[PDB]
Design a protein around this nucleic acid. Structure first.
Ligand SMILES: [Cl-]
Ligand code: NA
Ligand code: NA
Length: 315
DNA sequence: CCGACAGCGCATCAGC
DNA sequence: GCTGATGCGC
DNA sequence: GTCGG
C-alpha cells in the first residue's frame, strides 16, 4: 500500500541518526513510518497523511514529492554521497555507532574490508560485531528461538533450581521471528550477589554462549549459537531483583505502544507504573512506596484491568 | 516560541 | 589512580 | 520532525 513511503521515511530516519546524529529526527521519521504502515489505505497525498498523528508539514511535503516523482531529491543526493552512505553503512556493525562511523570514514575507513584491515583500531565489541556482521542481520525463526529457550531454561535450572528465567521481547508476544533473545533472570536471594556470572559460565560451559560483548553484575550482552551450523545470535541476560522481576517482565515484553497505554490507564486509576515498580499516588500526586508484586496479573489487578495475554499486547 | 521525545548498564574516553 | 562524560545497544 | 504547553 504505502511501502514506497515507509521505505523512504525509514531511509531518512537512518541518515538522521547515523550521519546527522539527530536522534529525535530519527525517532520522528520512524514514528511516522510506523503509523503509515498501519494505515489501511493507499495514501494519495501528503494532506491525507497529515491527518495521522506523527506526520507533520515536512513529511507531508516529502510524500507529495514522492507521489509525484517517485523519488526524493534529498534522498537521491544523500545516496550518491560517498561519505554519508559510508557512515550510514558502517553503523550496521554492532558496536559502531554514529560517532565511530564518522571517525572511521574521516580516516579513509569506509568499507567492511577496510575494517578488517584495521583491527587494531576497533574495540572488542566492534571486532565481534564485525566477525558476525552477516549473522547479526539475520532474523531468528521462532522454532530456533524455542530451541534456544529450552537450552537457557535447562542450564539456568542446573546452576540453581530456584532461579527464574523468562524470555521476553516479541518472542513472548508470539512473534514468528525475533532479532535477538532477551532473557530476564532472578533469584530469591537477590532483592533491592554474584548470580549472573554463574549463569553465564554454565551457558559457556555447554558452549551455547560463544562470545561476550559486555558483562557486569546485572546485565550480560553476548553471542550464542545452537548446536549443529546455525548462525550466531545476539543474546542479552538481565539479572533483576525478585521484588522487581514481574514489573521487568511486563516492561520488556512490551510492546512499546502497549506499555504507553498501560501506563496511561494506570494513572487514571491512581497508580504509576515504570520498569521496576508500581506505586500508588496520593491526593497531591506524591508516589508512595512500591506495591508487592508476585505475578504479572497482580499489576493488572492493581489498576483494575483485565489481564492481557502477551500474544495480544501489540497495542 | 520552545522543550520533550526513555534512560539504564556497561565499555570506553576525557580530564584531573 | 580516580571521577564524570560520552558512546552504544536495547 | 512532531506535538503540545
Ligand atoms: Cl534530533
Ligand atoms: Na499529523
Ligand atoms: Na552499530
Amino acid at each position: 500500500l504505502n511501502g514506497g513511503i515507509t521505505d523512504m521515511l525509514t531511509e531518512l530516519a537512518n541518515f538522521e541518526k547515523n550521519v546527522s546524529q539527530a536522534i529525535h529526527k530519527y525517532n520522528a521519521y520512524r514514528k511516522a513510518a510506523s503509523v503509515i504502515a498501519k494505515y489501511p489505505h493507499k495514501i494519495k497525498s501528503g494532506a491525507e497523511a497529515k491527518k495521522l498523528p506523527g506526520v507533520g508539514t515536512k513529511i507531508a511535503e516529502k510524500i507529495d514529492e514522492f507521489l509525484a516523482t517517485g523519488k526524493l531529491r534529498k534522498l537521491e543526493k544523500i545516496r550518491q554521497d560517498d561519505t554519508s552512505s559510508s557512515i550510514n553503512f558502517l553503523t550496521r556493525v554492532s558496536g559502531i555507532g554514529p560517532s565511530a562511523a564518522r571517525k572511521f570514514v574521516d580516516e579513509g575507513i569506509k568499507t567492511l574490508e577496510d575494517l578488517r584491515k584495521n583491527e587494531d583500531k576497533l574495540n572488542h565489541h566492534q571486532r565481534i560485531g564485525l566477525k558476525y556482521f552477516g549473522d547479526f542481520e539475520k532474523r531468528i525463526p521462532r522454532e530456533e528461538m524455542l530451541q534456544m529457550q529450552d537450552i537457557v531454561l535447562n542450564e539456568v535450572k542446573k546452576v540453581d533450581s530456584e532461579y527464574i528465567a523468562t524470555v521476553c521481547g516479541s518472542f513472548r508476544r508470539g512473534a514468528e521471528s525475533s532479532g535477538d533473545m532477551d532473557v530476564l533472570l532472578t533469584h530469591p536471594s537477590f532483592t533491592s550477589p554474584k548470580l549472573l556470572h554463574q549463569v553465564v559460565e554454565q551457558l559457556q560451559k555447554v558452549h551455547f554462549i560463544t562470545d561476550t560483548l559486555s558483562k557486569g553484575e546485572t546485565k550480560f550482552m553476548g553471542v550464542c549459537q545452537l548446536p549443529s551450523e546455525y548462525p550466531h545470535r545476539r543474546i542479552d541476560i538481565r539479572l533483576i531483583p525478585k521484588d522487581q522481576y514481574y514489573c521487568g517482565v511486563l516492561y520488556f515484553t512490551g510492546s512499546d505502544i502497549f506499555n504507553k497505554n498501560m501506563r496511561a490507564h494506570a494513572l487514571e486509576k491512581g497508580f504509576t507504573i515504570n520498569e521496576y515498580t508500581i506505586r500508588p499516588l496520593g491526593v497531591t500526586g506524591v508516589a508512595g512506596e512500591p506495591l508487592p508484586v508476585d505475578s504479572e496479573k497482580d499489576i493488572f489487578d492493581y489498576i483494575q484491568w483485565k489481564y492481557r495475554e502477551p500474544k495480544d499486547r501489540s497495542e
